[PDB]
C-alpha cells in the first residue's frame, strides 16, 4: 500500500501548495470587486476541504478535486481577459494529472488531458480576450504571477514525488540486503541459485578427492553435570566462534556443527591439489588454539581429531530445511579415526601417510600413525 | 546503476518525440520562409545528434540539450509573434526538467526553472507580440499544435518514467520475495529476525518440558557397498522428503537431518500439554510409512525409533554456518535408547511410560518398556 | 458580443491623408496587443500597423515612417493615422488582437482606395 501512500502525500503537498498560491493572490488584489470573491471563497474553502475529506472512498475524490479546478479556473478566466494566464494553468494541470493519477486508470487520465487541451483551444477562441476589471497593471502583476506559480507548483510537486520513490527504494535496498547477506552467510553462492528456482531437482556432486576433518570434546559429559545449562551453551559458542574464525582465514569449509562434534571439509567446493597439507596444518592450528582456549572450569579442554581422505558426494538431500552436506567412504573413516583416537592427538592412515610424510611429520603405531606435526626444517 | 537507466531512457525517448513533433510542424509550413529553415535544420540535427552521442562524459550532454532547446525556442519565438505559443513550451519544460535531472543536481535543476521563468515575463513584454510572417491562419494551426504538442510530451515523458518506476520496483519485490522465502523455510520466524540485526548476543532459551524422537537405519553400511553412491544419496532424499511431508502434517519440528539420523522435537517453538501424545502418534505412523517405503534393493528398511522427553535448550551457537539446534539431558536419553532398540520396534523410559499409558498402549521390557501403539477403543 | 468595427476608409488622392478608427467591443482595450492588417487581392491580409499593451508599436517595412497607431483607452478604440497615400495602399483595412486575429472572427474591414 505504498504506490497508495505515494498518491495520496503527493495529492495532498498539491492541495497546500495551491491553496497557498491563491491567498496571496488574494491578498494583493485591490478594488477588484467581490463578485470574483464570492467564487473566490468557494474555491479556496474547497481547496482546503478535499485534503480533510480525503476518507469517502474510491478514486472519486482526487477526480472532484480536479473537478472544482477546472470549474475555478474557467469561470474566473471568462470575466477576466485572456492575458491574465488562465491558460498557463490548465497546461500545468494537463501533465500534472498523469502524475497524479496511477497506471491503471491511464486511459482516463489520457481524457483528461485531452479535456484541458480541448479548453484552451476555446479559450482563447471563446472567451472574451483582455476584458479589464478596475486597475490594469493590477493584471500586469497577475499576469507575472500566474507564470512563477505555474513553474514552482509543477516543480515542488514532481521532486517531491521523485524523493518519495527514491527514498522508498533506499529503505527497500536495504531491506533486501539484508536477508540475501544472512542467505549468502549460510550457503555458498553457486548453491544458492539452484535452491531458489522454482524449479525442483536432486543436486548430488562427485568430487574426485577430498579431506575431512573430526574434531571432538572429551569428558563433556562431566563438565555439563557441575555447570548451569545457560552457561554452558555460552561456553559452546565462545569455543566454536574462534574455531570458526581459525577456519575462514584458512579458507577451508565447515559443514556444520553438531553438539561437540565439529566438522571440516578440504576441497569440495574447488579442488586443490595440496588439500591434504592445508587441512593437516590447520589441525595443528586448531590443537594449539584449542590447547590455549579456557573453560569455565578453568579445566583444560582437550580435542580429539581424526582425519580422513577420499571421494565425496555433496548436495542438499529431503524438502525442508536444507544445508550443503557431504557423504563418502572418507566420513565413515574419519568418525571411526576420531572415535578412537586419544586425548590430544591426531590420528591418520595408510594414505592419509602417503601424502603427508613427505610434507610432514607423522609416526608410531586398519594401521594409523599419528601426526606429530609439520618439519622444522625449510 | 538502474536510476541511470531510467534517467538516460527518458531522455532518448523525450529527443525522439520531440524531432517528431517538429518534423510535422515543419512539412505542414507554407511560404513561411527560409531564413527561419536555416535556423530549423539547425535545431532539428541538434536534437537527433544528441541522443546518439550521449557518451561523450558527465551531467554536461543533457545540460547542453536544454541550452540548444532554450536558444532555439527563445530565436524562434523572437522573430514571430508571442500569440504562436512558445510560452507554453518554456513552461512544460520547467516541469520537465526537474524530473530528468537527478536529486544530487536538485538546486541546479531548480535555477533551470528559475531561468525559464526568467524569460517568459520578458517573453510577453520584450518579445514584439504578433509579428506576423506569411500566412495568418497558418499561425492559427501553429497556435493549437503547440497546445496539443506540450500536453502530449509531458503526459508520455511521465507516463514513461513511471512505468520505469513501477517496473524496476516489481522485479525487484521478486528477486527478495524469492530470498524471504528461502530463509524463512530454513529457520524459524522469531530467531530469524535476531538473527537479522547487526547486534550480536546469544540466543539462549529454556525449556521445562519437551520431547525428542530419534530414527535410525540399519545396516546401511550394506546397502551402500552393493550400490552406487549417487544412487544412494537419491534415495536418502526420497525417503527425508516423504518424512518431511509427514511431519509437516503432523505440526511438529525437525532440527536436523544428519546422514541416517533423523531427529524430531516437539513443543520447544511453543509449548503444548499434550506434546508426548502428539509425538507418540507421529512416530507409529513414520513406522507404518517406513515398512511402506522401498529402496532400490528391494529389501525393507527398517528403523530404530527410540523417544526422550524433558527440559531442553534451543538457539544456535558458533559464529558462522548458524542452525537452530537443541540440548539437554532428555537428548542423551534419546540418542542411548535410540542406540540400543532393536529392528523396527520404539523404545520408551520410565517417565514416557507414566504419560503415555493412560493414553495409549506400551508394554514388556534404566528399565524400557517397548512402544506397541494407540488404544483400539475410543 | 465580442465585435471589432472599423470605419473612416473611403476616396483620396495619391498623397493625401486618413485616419482609420477601430472601436472593439467585449473586450478592454489597454490590456492588449492590436494590429492593422490590409488585403488587396494578390495575397492575404499582411499586418502594416501592430501597437502593444504598454506603448511599443511596429511596421512593416512597405509602409513605415508614413502610417502611425495610436490609441484610446476611455474609448476603447485604436487609430491608424496615415499619410502618403499611394496606389500600393488600395485596399481593404482590418483590425484585430492576434487571438481574432488567428481565429479568423474578424470584421468586413474598411475599403481604402488611392486614386484620382
Known amino acids: 500500500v505504498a504506490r497508495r501512500q505515494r498518491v495520496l502525500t503527493i495529492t495532498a503537498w498539491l492541495a497546500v501548495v495551491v491553496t497557498g498560491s491563491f491567498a496571496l493572490m488574494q491578498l494583493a488584489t485591490g478594488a477588484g470587486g467581490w463578485y470574483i470573491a464570492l467564487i473566490n471563497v468557494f474555491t479556496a474553502v474547497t481547496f482546503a476541504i478535499v485534503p480533510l475529506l480525503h476518507r469517502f472512498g474510491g478514486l472519486v475524490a482526487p477526480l472532484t478535486f480536479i473537478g472544482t479546478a477546472y470549474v475555478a479556473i474557467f469561470a474566473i478566466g471568462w470575466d477576466v481577459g485572456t492575458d491574465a494566464g488562465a491558460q498557463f494553468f490548465f497546461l500545468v494541470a494537463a501533465a500534472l494529472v498523469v502524475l497524479l493519477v496511477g497506471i491503471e486508470h491511464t486511459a482516463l487520465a489520457v481524457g483528461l488531458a485531452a479535456v484541458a487541451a480541448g479548453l484552451v483551444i476555446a479559450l482563447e477562441f471563446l472567451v472574451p480576450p483582455d476584458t479589464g476589471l478596475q486597475p490594469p497593471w493590477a493584471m500586469s502583476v497577475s499576469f507575472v504571477l500566474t507564470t512563477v506559480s505555474a513553474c514552482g507548483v509543477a516543480v515542488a510537486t514532481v521532486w517531491f514525488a521523485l524523493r518519495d520513490t527514491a527514498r522508498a527504494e533506499a529503505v527497500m535496498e536495504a531491506e533486501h540486503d539484508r536477508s540475501e547477506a544472512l542467505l549468502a552467510n549460510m550457503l555458498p553462492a553457486s548453491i544458492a541459485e539452484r535452491l531458489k528456482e522454482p524449479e525442483r531437482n536432486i543436486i548430488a556432486d562427485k568430487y574426485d578427492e577430498a579431506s575431512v576433518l573430526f574434531a571432538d570434546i572429551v569428558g563433556f559429559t562431566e563438565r555439563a553435570s557441575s555447570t548451569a545449562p545457560a552457561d554452558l551453551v555460552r561456553f559452546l559458542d565462545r569455543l566454536y566462534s574462534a574455531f570458526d574464525e581459525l577456519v575462514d582465514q584458512h579458507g577451508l569449509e565447515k559443514i556444520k556443527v553438531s553438539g561437540d562434534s565439529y566438522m571440516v571439509v578440504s576441497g569440495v567446493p574447488r579442488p586443490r591439489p595440496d588439500h591434504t597439507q592445508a587441512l593437516a596444518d590447520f589441525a595443528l592450528d586448531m590443537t594449539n588454539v584449542a590447547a590455549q582456549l579456557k573453560d569455565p572450569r578453568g579445566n583444560p579442554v582437550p580435542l580429539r581429531v581424526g582425519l580422513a581422505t577420499g571421494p565425496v558426494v555433496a548436495g542438499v538431500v529431503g524438502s525442508r530445511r536444507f544445508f550443503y552436506d557431504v557423504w563418502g567412504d572418507a566420513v565413515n573413516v574419519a568418525s571411526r579415526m576420531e572415535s578412537t583416537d586419544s586425548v590430544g592427538q591426531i590420528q591418520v592412515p595408510d594414505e592419509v601417510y602417503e601424502r603427508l610424510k613427505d610434507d610432514f611429520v607423522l609416526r608410531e603405531r586398519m594401521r594409523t600413525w599419528y601426526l606429530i606435526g609439520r618439519k622444522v626444517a625449510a | 546503476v538502474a536510476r541511470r537507466q531510467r534517467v538516460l531512457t527518458i531522455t532518448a525517448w523525450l529527443a525522439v518525440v520531440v524531432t517528431g513533433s517538429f518534423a510535422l510542424m515543419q512539412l505542414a509550413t507554407g511560404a513561411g520562409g527560409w531564413y527561419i529553415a536555416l535556423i530549423n535544420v539547425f535545431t532539428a540535427v541538434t536534437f537527433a545528434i544528441v541522443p546518439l552521442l550521449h557518451r561523450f562524459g558527465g551531467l554536461v550532454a543533457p545540460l547542453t540539450f536544454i541550452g540548444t532547446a532554450y536558444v532555439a525556442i527563445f530565436a524562434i519565438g523572437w522573430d514571430v509573434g508571442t500569440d504562436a505559443g512558445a510560452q507554453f513550451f518554456f513552461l512544460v519544460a520547467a516541469a520537465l526538467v526537474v524530473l530528468l535531472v537527478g536529486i544530487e543536481h536538485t538546486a541546479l535543476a531548480v535555477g533551470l526553472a528559475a531561468v525559464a521563468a526568467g524569460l517568459v515575463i520578458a517573453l510577453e513584454f520584450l518579445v514584439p507580440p504578433d509579428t506576423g510572417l506569411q500566412p495568418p491562419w497558418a499561425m492559427s494551426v501553429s497556435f493549437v499544435l503547440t497546445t496539443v504538442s506540450a500536453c502530449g510530451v509531458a503526459v508520455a515523458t511521465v507516463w514513461f518514467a513511471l512505468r520505469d518506476t513501477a517496473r524496476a520496483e516489481a522485479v525487484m519485490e521478486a528477486e527478495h520475495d524469492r530470498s524471504e522465502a528461502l530463509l524463512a523455510n530454513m529457520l524459524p520466524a522469531s530467531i530469524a529476525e535476531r538473527l537479522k540485526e547487526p547486534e550480536r548476543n546469544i540466543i539462549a532459551d529454556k525449556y521445562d518440558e519437551a520431547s525428542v524422537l530419534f530414527a535410525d537405519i540399519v545396516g546401511f553400511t550394506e546397502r551402500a557397498s552393493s550400490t552406487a553412491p549417487a544412487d544412494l544419496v537419491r534415495f536418502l532424499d526420497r525417503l527425508y522428503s516423504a518424512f518431511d511431508e509427514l511431519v509437516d502434517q503432523h505440526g511438529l519440528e525437525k532440527i536436523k537431518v544428519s546422514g541416517d539420523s533423523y531427529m524430531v522435537v516437539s513443543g520447544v517453538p511453543r509449548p503444548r500439554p499434550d506434546h508426548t501424545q502428539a509425538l507418540a502418534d507421529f512416530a507409529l505412523d513414520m513406522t507404518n510409512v517406513a515398512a511402506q517405503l522401498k529402496d532400490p534393493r528391494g529389501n525393507p528398511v527398517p528403523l530404530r525409533v527410540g523417544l526422550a522427553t524433558g527440559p531442553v535448550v534451543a538457539g544456535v551457537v558458533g559464529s558462522r554456518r548458524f542452525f537452530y539446534d537443541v540440548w539437554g539431558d532428555a537428548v542423551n536419553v534419546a540418542s542411548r535408547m535410540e542406540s540400543t532398540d532393536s529392528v523396527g520396534q520404539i523404545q520408551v523410559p520410565d517417565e514416557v511410560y507414566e504419560r503415555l499409558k493412560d493414553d495409549f498402549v506400551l508394554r514388556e521390557r534404566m528399565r524400557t518398556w517397548y512402544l506397541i501403539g494407540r488404544k483400539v477403543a475410543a | 458580443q465580442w465585435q471589432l468595427v472599423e470605419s473612416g476608409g473611403g476616396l483620396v488622392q495619391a498623397g493625401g491623408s486618413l485616419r482609420l478608427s477601430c472601436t472593439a467591443s467585449?473586450?478592454?482595450?489597454?490590456?492588449?496587443?492590436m494590429g492593422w492588417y490590409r488585403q488587396t487581392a494578390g495575397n492575404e491580409r499582411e499586418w502594416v500597423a501592430f501597437?502593444?499593451?504598454?506603448?511599443?508599436?511596429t511596421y512593416a517595412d512597405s509602409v513605415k515612417g508614413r502610417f502611425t497607431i495610436s490609441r484610446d483607452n476611455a474609448k476603447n478604440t485604436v487609430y491608424l493615422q496615415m499619410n502618403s497615400l499611394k496606389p500600393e495602399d488600395t485596399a481593404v483595412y482590418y483590425c484585430?488582437?492576434?487571438?481574432?486575429?488567428?481565429?479568423?472572427?474578424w470584421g468586413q474591414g474598411t475599403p481604402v482606395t488611392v486614386s484620382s
Open positions: 484585430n488582437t492576434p487571438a481574432g486575429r488567428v481565429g479568423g472572427t
Open positions: 467585449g473586450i478592454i482595450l489597454s490590456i492588449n496587443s
Open positions: 501597437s502593444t499593451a504598454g506603448g511599443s508599436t
